[PDB]
Design an enzyme around this catalytic site. Structure first.
Site, PDB file in Angstrom:
ATOM      1  N   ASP A  25      29.395  32.121  32.172  1.00 36.67           N
ATOM      2  CA  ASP A  25      30.487  31.436  32.852  1.00 36.67           C
ATOM      3  C   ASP A  25      31.257  30.547  31.893  1.00 36.67           C
ATOM      4  O   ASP A  25      30.661  29.790  31.131  1.00 36.67           O
ATOM      5  CB  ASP A  25      29.941  30.587  34.009  1.00 36.67           C
ATOM      6  CG  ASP A  25      30.538  30.978  35.342  1.00 36.67           C
ATOM      7  OD1 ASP A  25      31.688  30.570  35.614  1.00 36.67           O
ATOM      8  OD2 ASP A  25      29.865  31.707  36.112  1.00 36.67           O
ATOM      9  N   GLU A  30      33.050  35.940  30.864  1.00 34.65           N
ATOM     10  CA  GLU A  30      34.162  35.721  31.773  1.00 34.65           C
ATOM     11  C   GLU A  30      35.204  34.906  31.044  1.00 34.65           C
ATOM     12  O   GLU A  30      35.011  33.723  30.765  1.00 34.65           O
ATOM     13  CB  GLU A  30      33.697  34.959  33.007  1.00 34.65           C
ATOM     14  CG  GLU A  30      34.650  34.996  34.186  1.00 34.65           C
ATOM     15  CD  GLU A  30      34.393  33.844  35.127  1.00 34.65           C
ATOM     16  OE1 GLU A  30      34.645  33.990  36.345  1.00 34.65           O
ATOM     17  OE2 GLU A  30      33.943  32.781  34.632  1.00 34.65           O
ATOM     18  N   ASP A  64      36.053  33.962  44.458  1.00 35.52           N
ATOM     19  CA  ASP A  64      37.179  33.068  44.241  1.00 35.52           C
ATOM     20  C   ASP A  64      38.500  33.615  44.790  1.00 35.52           C
ATOM     21  O   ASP A  64      39.542  32.977  44.634  1.00 35.52           O
ATOM     22  CB  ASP A  64      37.335  32.769  42.744  1.00 35.52           C
ATOM     23  CG  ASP A  64      36.091  32.146  42.135  1.00 35.52           C
ATOM     24  OD1 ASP A  64      35.581  31.154  42.713  1.00 35.52           O
ATOM     25  OD2 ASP A  64      35.626  32.644  41.076  1.00 35.52           O
TER      26      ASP A  64
END
Ligand SMILES: [Ca+2]
Ligand SMILES: [Ca+2]
Lengths: 585, 585
Positions: free
Chosen positions: B325, B354, B421
């Site tokens: 992340d 990511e 998200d």
């Protein structure tokens, strides 16, 4: 404008930090295609309604076919996003971003430099930024100790013309006895070609990495050398041949003796046992079919640890850095780790590599400090020596090169005029000192690290190897002290003018017809301009100089004081005469 | 041809090996400027007068503004230099090399790939090349144990409309009980968002990196998950957040209490003391002012070793890979070393990062295996859902992005349609199933790894956060088993056609008016072409198909047989229909 000709990437040589909070950006476009380049940026997490910062990208230079714009972004957050606004000759504007091109800034997208870590800031040794290196070919520099000369050594004379199998007894002891000389000249470091236990004349096939070749000296003598050099303000650079070793390397001879029973069989690249044959090889070597040079598997932990240990041993002796040979043929992981080893033992240890092609992959800041600037020579040989290219071309070749890698690297490139593998530059100049002197003036005032080849300073001449490896001329009456003083003065000037060592580079004037080139070096408010008249005729030129950059210049070489009137500077240069104008700032 | 628009480099994504002796090369040019691209190469140490090798560069595809050519160079020596031969519309022949362009080969110079080390050949896990990942948000997937439900947990209903602070009790046990369902769907791997001990709802502020948050279960439970999942052929990928830690993190709290006299003070980026404050940040954190998320100092060796230990721990539990992340804000040195660890512990562990922008610097082969393919999502949303772009633009966006990184990366990029998200793709399609399916059919047949967001396979719809976190509908009556079955068939087909998992991608047809797009996946001799009738109207299409790739094709979804005549294939697609034609080989 031709958008398909504009390029940029958030990395490499177009996007990189120069400080922990400052991101540099380069953008190129077809020459003449773009007139103004501005950069709008802000922290990556900035609200989409917040105002962006502006940054003007100056034309940093232009080569044969491209234009180069460079700008500096202030990133206090250490995180940044940015888009380009490019304006053409006709006012047509367009934003350039990660998404592409658009008239609307939003649709152009935005390039992103995720984060700037302090550890990823390209950092090189300070002593290197204002250094002048002197290349020493031990076997031919000075014979300080006759007791170690190899059998059949030839008389040391100026008239001697070296043969491929010659010997002169050059050794480390001579380098010491001659240290007062190097110090007088002003060199701040000595780079030695290979000098480690080896059976050949070249010594490129290492037999013992932990020992100085008997014909050159011994650890004691080496320690003495390092110590005597240092108190003289001279660093020591050794040649690292880690890509391949000699066929007498203990690890290899074991495999030759024990075949698959060798605990070192995987230290090389062997196809089948037994391992050996003349004119044929069943193991990988340097280049093609070179038995004396078995490649080392730098990917192997054992090999890696061993060479790293070899580096520690020599670094323990007090050296100041390495010159890597065939560096481009050893894995990156190795180089990345090597730098760590090396930099931790000595933050000021230098790492210079030798790649005969675009070395960007090695010059991002995590591997080498710089490399040999062969491009520099090519442009210089053809410009001053063969005259195959004219001033406008010379300007391009140079510029194209500067924008090749990050400034931390461009600033530290070793700019050589020749080497032990090339004919001497004086010879390349067909013996003409007028041409040679001019070139050296350029070498000593351009962006990068000047590398002096032993003997060039007193005007030695000679064809390519092995004639370029003639024994160093020490009889003062047989030396060109006029030349010697020239190098001294140039070197002395380069040491006092901060711009010459740590300044940027900008082209000032290029006349394809008159073949006169000019550029200016800048640091802070100081400006130093160099005018080179590369012609066998007296010529006069008109240079532009707005009062903002000064109104009066002093030729550091002659003391002559010229004045600029109406934003112009009238200069009359004599044949092959060069001028170094300081603005007193 | 605009020469200033041709691009190449012997590194990055334009020159990279696919094997120890095979180097891939790509070239960029203005669309239409080059019609023929051939490469002439030889060994880097080959004699000048030696016969050069030939390799034709096929047109790999084109995008908004450029054309892309690709070639595979056979380099038995693992060493190669090469020069490009570009041919234009009017037959002009231009050589392209490291030196530049010229009508003469010698003056063009040559690009060089110094050496190819196996330790540098991009390598990714074999199971990921045929994997189909399933994204699971533990809290909303399934409640296998109510005893861990935090106070305020709401009822598990299909018509439930979650609020930001809602609680449904999803836990690991739930995942365990539902393994049969997942196994049936055919997913080969499970991806969990952060699920480590945290005081918050989202769990992005890690308090204990060595323990599963009580709300999901215990370490013994996780172990049960890994084994039971493993026996179903399902892998487990955990989300790691190393850029920053939680304000409850043991190391951090030590600073909040011992202030400057904190043994862990240099583990973060602290401005001044006291170490913290409310609503105001006096220390660096994720994004802007996030007191619960202080940036961790990964450059620091103590932190590095700790984060690694944390890594070792969970990998010892048998996980199969990591999804990093906000990785783009951690130093590369860290990721380079992270890979080395992870991989040595398990060569099949996956490392997916990511980063929401061009991530080439992290996708060279020494760091991550892949990243979320956000460019893919954008291309599918604007093409299938919003209709912002037509078939020709879709083609470009796809082509351009495909060429961003080396093939080994592109092939393993995570192709998501949505995430925790964003809104459900079905919501993006405005509830139109005909569209949703076509997008999924593409997702299941395009280059990359399909990512299925929990619920999307049974047709769950919903707005963006927190509406995208709706409880999984396990009541079969309330499930769109119709769509579910479709999902299954695609997954099956993907697992049976090597070309859909390991084959390349080539656009077959694109029509901006009909809005029809087709592409072909090819591996060895098998060819499978996808035709998309992305329009609410029955259309006919005439595709060009030389007898070479076959003369007969089979639609794997309907079993219809299609025959080509005189190099043409006539296909009739119903509204929003997509065909998957197998060449039978
Ligand atoms: Ca001697
Ligand atoms: Ca529960």
């Amino acid at each position: 404008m031709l958008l398909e000709a504009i390029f940029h990437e958030a990395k490499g040589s177009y996007a990189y930090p120069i400080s922990e909070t400052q991101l540099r950006v380069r953008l190129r476009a077809k020459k003449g295609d773009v007139v103004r380049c501005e950069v709008l940026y802000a922290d990556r997490y900035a609200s989409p309604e917040e105002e962006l910062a502006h940054a003007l990208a100056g034309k940093a230079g232009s080569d044969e076919r491209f234009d180069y714009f460079e700008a500096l972004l202030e990133c206090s957050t250490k995180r940044v996003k940015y888009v380009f606004l490019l304006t053409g000759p006709q006012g047509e504007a367009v934003y350039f971003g990660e998404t592409g091109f658009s008239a609307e800034r939003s649709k152009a997208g935005v390039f992103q430099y995720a984060y700037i870590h302090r550890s990823e800031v390209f950092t090189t040794p300070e002593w290197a930024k204002e250094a002048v290196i002197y290349q020493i070919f031990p076997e031919r520099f000075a014979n300080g100790d006759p007791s170690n000369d190899p059998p059949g050594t030839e008389q040391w004379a100026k008239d001697a013309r070296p043969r491929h199998d010659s010997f002169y007894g050059g050794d480390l002891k001579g380098v010491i006895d001659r240290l007062p000389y190097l110090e007088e000249l002003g060199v701040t470091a000595l780079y030695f070609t290979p000098i480690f236990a080896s059976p050949s004349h070249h010594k490129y096939d290492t037999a013992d990495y932990l020992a100085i070749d008997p014909q050159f000296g011994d650890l004691p003598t080496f320690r003495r050398l390092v110590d005597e050099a240092h108190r003289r303000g001279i660093k020591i650079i050794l040649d690292a041949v880690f890509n391949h070793a000699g066929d007498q390397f203990f690890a290899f001879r074991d495999v030759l003796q024990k075949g698959e029973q060798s605990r070192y069989k995987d230290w090389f690249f062997i196809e089948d046992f037994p391992v050996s044959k003349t004119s044929r090889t069943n193991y990988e070597t340097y280049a093609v079919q070179v038995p004396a040079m078995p490649k080392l598997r730098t990917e192997n932990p054992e090999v890696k640890e061993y060479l790293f240990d070899v580096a520690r041993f020599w670094m323990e002796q007090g050296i100041d850095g390495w010159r890597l040979d065939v560096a481009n043929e050893v894995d990156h992981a190795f180089w990345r780790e090597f730098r760590r080893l090396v930099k931790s033992l000595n933050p000021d240890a230098l790492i210079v590599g030798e790649i005969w092609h675009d070395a960007s992959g090695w010059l991002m800041g995590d591997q080498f400090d710089s490399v040999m600037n062969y491009l520099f020579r090519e442009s210089v040989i053809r410009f001053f020596a063969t005259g195959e290219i004219h001033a406008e071309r010379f300007d391009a070749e140079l510029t194209r090169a500067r924008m090749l890698y990050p400034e931390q690297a461009a600033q530290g490139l070793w700019n050589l005029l020749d080497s032990h593998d090339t004919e001497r530059f004086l010879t390349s100049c067909g013996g003409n000192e007028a041409k040679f002197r001019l070139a050296v003036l350029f070498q000593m005032t351009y962006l990068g690290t000047p590398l002096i080849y032993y003997g060039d300073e007193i005007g030695m001449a000679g064809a390519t190897d092995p004639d370029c490896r003639r024994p160093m001329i020490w009889e003062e009456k047989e030396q060109n002290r006029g030349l010697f003083e020239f190098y001294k003065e140039l070197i002395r000037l380069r040491h006092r003018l901060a711009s010459l060592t740590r300044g940027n580079v900008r082209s000032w004037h290029a006349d394809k017809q008159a073949n006169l080139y000019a550029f200016v070096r800048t640091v802070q408010d100081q400006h130093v301009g160099v005018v080179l008249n590369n012609r066998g005729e007296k010529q006069t030129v008109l240079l532009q100089v707005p009062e903002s950059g000064g109104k009066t210049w002093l030729d550091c070489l002659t003391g002559e004081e010229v004045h600029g009137k109406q934003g112009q500077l009238k200069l009359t240069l004599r044949p092959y005469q060069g001028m170094i104008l300081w603005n007193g700032r």
